[PDB]
Each structure stands twice: as C-alpha cells, then as structure tokens.
Amino acid sequence: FETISSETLHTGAIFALRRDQVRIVTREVVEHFGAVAIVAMDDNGNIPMVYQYRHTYGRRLWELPAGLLDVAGEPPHLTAARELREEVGLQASTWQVLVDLDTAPGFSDESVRVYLATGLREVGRTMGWYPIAEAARRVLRGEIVNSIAIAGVLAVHAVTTGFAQPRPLDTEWIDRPTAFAARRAER
Amino acid sequence: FETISSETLHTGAIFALRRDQVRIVTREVVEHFGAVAIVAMDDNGNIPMVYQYRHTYGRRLWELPAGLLDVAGEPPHLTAARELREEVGLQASTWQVLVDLDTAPGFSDESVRVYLATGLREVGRTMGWYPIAEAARRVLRGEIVNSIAIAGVLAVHAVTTGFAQPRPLDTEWIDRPTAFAARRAER
Ligand SMILES: Nc1ncnc2c1ncn2[C@@H]1O[C@H](COP(=O)(O)OP(=O)(O)OC[C@H]2O[C@H](O)[C@H](O)[C@@H]2O)[C@@H](O)[C@H]1O
Ligand SMILES: Nc1ncnc2c1ncn2[C@@H]1O[C@H](COP(=O)(O)OP(=O)(O)OC[C@H]2O[C@H](O)[C@H](O)[C@@H]2O)[C@@H](O)[C@H]1O
Ligand SMILES: [Gd+3]
Ligand SMILES: [Gd+3]
C-alpha cells in the first residue's frame, strides 16, 4: 500500500480528520493523541472504576481511570500515574504494562496503553471498587462496554487467574499515535 | 447534560463528523454505522482470525472477521453471518451474543457487537486458526491489539474456561449506532 496524497479536512480540540489516497481509494483517518488507562489492583484483588458520562452515547459508562496523551513530551506512564492520582486519588509503587489496544482500527489512529498498578497508597486530601472477578462478569454481562475497560478488566482477570503475566514498562507500544501531536495546533 | 446545538462538519464514506454544544463546551462526535464481528469456535476450541492491513496504523493486524452495519435495514446477525461466510467461508448453526464494546467512547458513537458462532460448516467454493488459549496469550503478549479482537478473544476464553456464558441473540445492544445511518447520504 502507499499514501498517494493526504488532505486535512478538520482540526479539532482532541483530533484531526485527514483524508488520504491509498495504493487507489479514499481513506479517512481521525488522528488522535492516544491515551493511557490504569487497572489499579489492591491487595485483595479489587480495582477502582469510574462511572462517567460519554456524550457520544448520551449516557454514563463504567470505565478505568484514563486520560489523553495531550501533554507534549510527557511520558505515558507519568500521564497514567497522574490520572490515577487525579481520577481516584491513588498512588502505586509498582507500574507494569497490562494491555495495549487499537480502539477504532477502521477509522482512527488512536491506541491506548493500559497499565497495571499495584502497591497502592491512598493519597491527597463517581467511582466504585470491584473484585476483579465481579468486574469480569460485568463485562460478560454487558454492564462494562467501554473497550479500554473491557481489555483491561479481562486482561487483569487472565493475570489474576494465573493465565498470564503483566509486562515491563519498557514494552514497545507499537501503535502509539504521533500524527496529531506532531501537528502541534496550539498558539 | 444537554445538546444546545449541533453542526455537521463533514460527511464521508463510512462516518460523519459532527460538533455539538453540550450542557457549556464543544463536543466533536464521529457518527459511525456500528459494526459486528464473529468468534467462530469449532469443535476443538479453535477460532479463525484474519490478518488485515489497517491504513490507520500503516500495518496488518490480526482480527476477527468483521464488517460495518452499512446495509440499511439489515439485521446485525445477518450482517455478521454474511461476513463470516464472505470472510472465512464458514456457516454456523448456532449464533449467540458474546460481547458488545464501545470502541472509542471519547469521540465516536461506534459500538460493535461480537457474536459467538458454533456448529460450523465450511461452505462455498490471509487467515489462521488459533486454539482459544493460544489466541488469549497472543492478546496478553501484544500480538493481538485490535480492540474488537481483544474483547472477543478474551470473552470466549472466559466462556471456554467456564467462567461465563454466551448470550441470546435478542440481548439488547444498548449503544448500537443510529445517527449516521439516519443521515442516509446516498443518492
Ligand atoms: N469529542 C470531543 N470534542 C472536544 N473535546 C473533547 C471531546 N472528547 C473529550 N474532550 C475533552 O478532552 C478532555 C478529557 O480529557 P481526558 O480526561 O484526558 O480523557 P478522556 O476523554 O476520558 O479519554 C481517555 C480515553 O477514554 C475514552 O475511552 C476516549 O476514547 C479515550 O481513549 C475533556 O475534559 C474535554 O476537553
Ligand atoms: N477510513 C475510511 N475511509 C473511507 N472508507 C473506508 C475507511 N475505512 C474503511 N473504509 C471502507 O469500508 C469498507 C470496509 O467494510 P467492512 O469490511 O464492512 O468493515 P471493516 O473496515 O473491516 O470494519 C469492521 C470493524 O473493524 C474495524 O476494527 C473498524 O474499526 C470496524 O469496527 C472498505 O472496503 C472500504 O470501503
Ligand atoms: Gd481527566
Ligand atoms: Gd468486508
């Protein structure tokens, strides 16, 4: 395949719409910052989840703490750690890579890195705590549909059941977005 | 929350970009057809997966057979069944709902229904067959990143391990997209 020509159709707050001419057909791409989410598992196998309104669906969805990689030059896990604190007031001693997911492969370059945070300390001074198994059943029951949450919950469930292991922070993030950030549309 | 006003910024082949004024801030939404995917498990616990090029990432990703709900008035599972046949030349006697996922909750209304198809017959006249456990490990190892694939693979893995059950075809698909189709931008 080959990109013949590409044209910017729109630049917004968190993404830009671009149209390319490929190998020869049209291919519209939503350039995204990319994001990070966190599965913060405590000493008893519970993780915190937030109930957030999503205008796209016109309703609140249960999700993992998460934020966009909108801070230029900021390392992903630093962004992640920041969100875990701001989102659920937790700090973690151990940070590992749990699962990366390409959210909308058909039309956007967004990719999300989900970290597994352990060794939690409540710091600072809607969300709910769920036993990992309870969370896994909510997924398989349709009560958790956010794609990042689904991946993170079922991944940590596979880990907690001894089926798989978390990974090193230096694990390559193959599809981490760069296009939108490269635009630097900020005065 | 409340949508003050909404403006169409772009209408493309598979999606439209719309900007709303919410409750008061800007909220850009990518209206999508929605899609369906299939986890076709054979009698030995294997499922077929396709290796497809995704321009968004500039590379091929391992995925579950899937297609957009771009056929007006066509029932999702009929679309699904059609794709399973066209994509991997398989027909299934049993169709159930496995997992629904909201792909990019932050900027698009797309939602994808993943069905579990069983009782397979090879019909007609790149893809590969994977034991469900092999597929689950590929996910946790980063070799499967497509979000729909991640959800489907780990969901059927939870099913095959006896942790959860498939669901009836009449299960409500809460976030099934309707906006883009409603536009009917076809002469
Ligand atoms: N469609 C949009 N249009 C304009 N602004 C938006 C839009 N969507 C979100 N924003 C905004 O960006 C800011 C949200 O930042 P974060 O809290 O860092 O991230 P978040 O929206 O929760 O997304 C993290 C991740 O989860 C979602 O599943 C989303 O798809 C993304 O990958 C919001 O306060 C608001 O300015
Ligand atoms: N960004 C795009 N711009 C223009 N046309 C596109 C674009 N992306 C895909 N298409 C096209 O739509 C048709 C593909 O249809 P399907 O095979 O029905 O579906 P598919 O693209 O594989 O997507 C199914 C699902 O998987 C992906 O993860 C995608 O995010 C979606 O939910 C392609 O042949 C081509 O016309
Ligand atoms: Gd935030
Ligand atoms: Gd097709």
Instruction: Write the DSSP assignment of chain B as a string of letters.
Output: --EEEEEEEEE-SSEEEEEEEE--EEEEEEEE--EEEEEE--TTSEEEEEEEEETTTTEEEEE--EEE--STT--HHHHHHHHHHHHH-EEEEEEEEEEEEBS-TTTB---EEEEEEEEEEE----EEEEEHHHHHHHHTTTS--BHHHHHHHHHHHHHHTTS---B-TT---TT---HHHHH----
B83 is in an annotated binding site: yes
Looking up tokens 């940070």, which residue turns up?
A95
Residue spans of beta strands (DSSP E) within chain A: 3-11, 15-22, 25-32, 35-40, 46-54, 59-63, 66-68, 90-101, 112-122, 127-131
Tell me how far apart the alpha carbons of residues B53 and B50 are, in angstroms, rounded to a whole number. 10
* Structure token pair of residue A183: 């635009």
User: Which amino acid would we find at residue B7?
Assistant: E
Ligand 1 and B74: CB distance under 6 A: no
Taking an 8 Å cut-off on Cβ atoms, the answer to whether B151 and A154 are in contact is yes
Closest by alpha carbon to B130, among B63, B67, B85? Answer: B63
**Nearest Cα to Cα of residue B79 among B87, B88, B71, B91:** B71
**Which among A17, A56, A105 has CB closest to B56?**
A105
Mutate to test the interface with A, among B150, B160, B163, B176 (most CBs of A within 10 A): B150
| Sequence-ordered list of residues with C-beta below 8 angstroms from that of A173, at least 6 positions apart, any chain | A76, A100, A111, A113
Q: How many CB atoms lie within 10 A of CB A182?
A: 8
Q: Which residues of chain B have a CB within 8 Å of the CB of A20?
A: 55
Residues B17-23: contacts with CB under 8 Å, at least 24 apart: B17/A9, B17/A10, B17/A17, B18/B179, B19/A12, B20/A55, B22/A55
Is A24 exposed, middle or buried, given 0-12, 13-18 or 19+ CB atoms closer than 10 A?
Answer: exposed
Q: Do B140 and A164 touch (CB under 8 A)?
A: yes
Enumerate the residues of chain B whose CB falls inside 8 A of the CB of residue A103: 103-104, 147
| C-alpha distance from residue B82 to each of A144, B51, B94, B105 (Å) | 27, 19, 14, 27
Q: What is the C-alpha to C-alpha distance for residues B40 and B149, in angstroms, rounded to an integer?
A: 12
Gap between the Cα atoms of B140 and A98, Å rounded: 7
Asked if A39 and A117 touch (Cβ cutoff 8 Å), the reply is: yes
Contacts of A26 (CB under 8 A, 6+ apart): A19, A20, B12, B13
Question: What would the two tokens of residue B71 be?
Answer: 């056929």
Q: Which pair of tokens denotes residue B21?
A: 């004024």
Cβ pair B119, B86 in contact under 8 A: no
Cα-Cα-Cα-Cα torsion A25, B65, B179, B145, nearest 10 degrees, comes to -90
Contact A88, A50 (CB under 8 A): yes
Both tokens of A177, joined, read: 């977005």
Task: Count the neighbouring beta carbons within 10 Å of the beta carbon of residue B73.
Answer: 5
Torsion of CA B106, B107, B109, B114, to 10 degrees: -60
Type of residue found at B166: P
Report which DSSP code applies to A55: T
What is the residue whose two structure tokens read 């939404």?
B29
Residue B34 neighbours by CB under 8 Å, 6+ apart: B68, B69, B109, B110, B111, B112, B113, B176, B177
| Alpha carbon separation from B18 to A52, A56, B52 (Å, rounded) | 21, 11, 29
H or E element in which residue A164 lies:
none
CA distance A149 to B169: 23
Dihedral, CA of residue A129, residue A131, residue A135 and residue A138, to nearest 10 = -100
Residue A114 burial (10 A CB sphere; 0-12, 13-18, 19+): buried
Which residue's CA lies nearest to atom 7 of ligand 2? A27
Is B28 in contact with A70 (CB distance < 8 Å)?
no
Query: Does the beta carbon of B26 lie inside 6 Å of ligand 1?
Result: yes
How many Cβ atoms sit within 10 Å of the Cβ of residue A117? 25
For residue B83, the ligand closest to its alpha carbon is 4
Residue nearest to atom 31 of ligand 1 (CA): B106
> Tokens standing for A12?
């917004």
Task: State how beta strands B90-101 and B112-122 pair.
Answer: antiparallel
CA distance B172 to B158: 21
Question: In whole angstroms, what separates CA B61 from the centre of its chain?
Answer: 14
Q: Is residue A66 annotated as involved in ligand binding?
A: yes
Domains and CATH numbers, chain A: 1-187 (3.90.79.10)
Q: Which of A39, A82, A89 is nearest to A63 (CA)?
A: A39
Q: A74-81, long-range: CB within 8 Å, 24+ apart, which pairs?
A: A76/A36, A76/A113, A76/A173, A76/A176, A77/A36, A77/A115, A77/A169, A79/A36, A80/A36, A80/A37, A80/A38, A80/A113, A80/A115, A80/A117, A81/A117
Cα-trace Rg, chain A = 18
Contacts of residue A186, defined as CB under 8 A and 6 or more positions apart, other chains included, come to none
Do residues A27 and B12 lie in contact, with contact meaning Cβ atoms separated by under 8 Å?
Answer: no
Is residue A135 helix, strand or coil? Answer: helix
Q: What per-residue string of b and e applies to A61-85 under the rule 16 or more CB within 10 Å gives b? A: bbbbbbbbbbeeeeebbebbbebbe
The residue whose CA is least distant from atom 30 of ligand 1 is B106
The angle formed by the CA atoms of residues B108, B110 and B112, to the nearest 5 degrees, is 150
**Whole-angstrom distance, CA of residue B13 vs CA of residue B165:** 37
Instruction: Return the structure tokens found at A170.
Output: 């230096």
* Nearest to A96, CA basis, from A111, A82, A76: A76
Q: Is B185 marked as binding a ligand? A: no
Which tokens belong to B75? Answer: 């029932």
- Residue A133's φ and ψ, nearest 5 degrees, are -70, -35
User: What phi and psi, each to the nearest 5 degrees, are found at residue A119?
Assistant: 60, 65
Using most ligand atoms within 8 A of CB, pick from B7, B19, B28, B101 the residue to mutate for ligand 1. B28
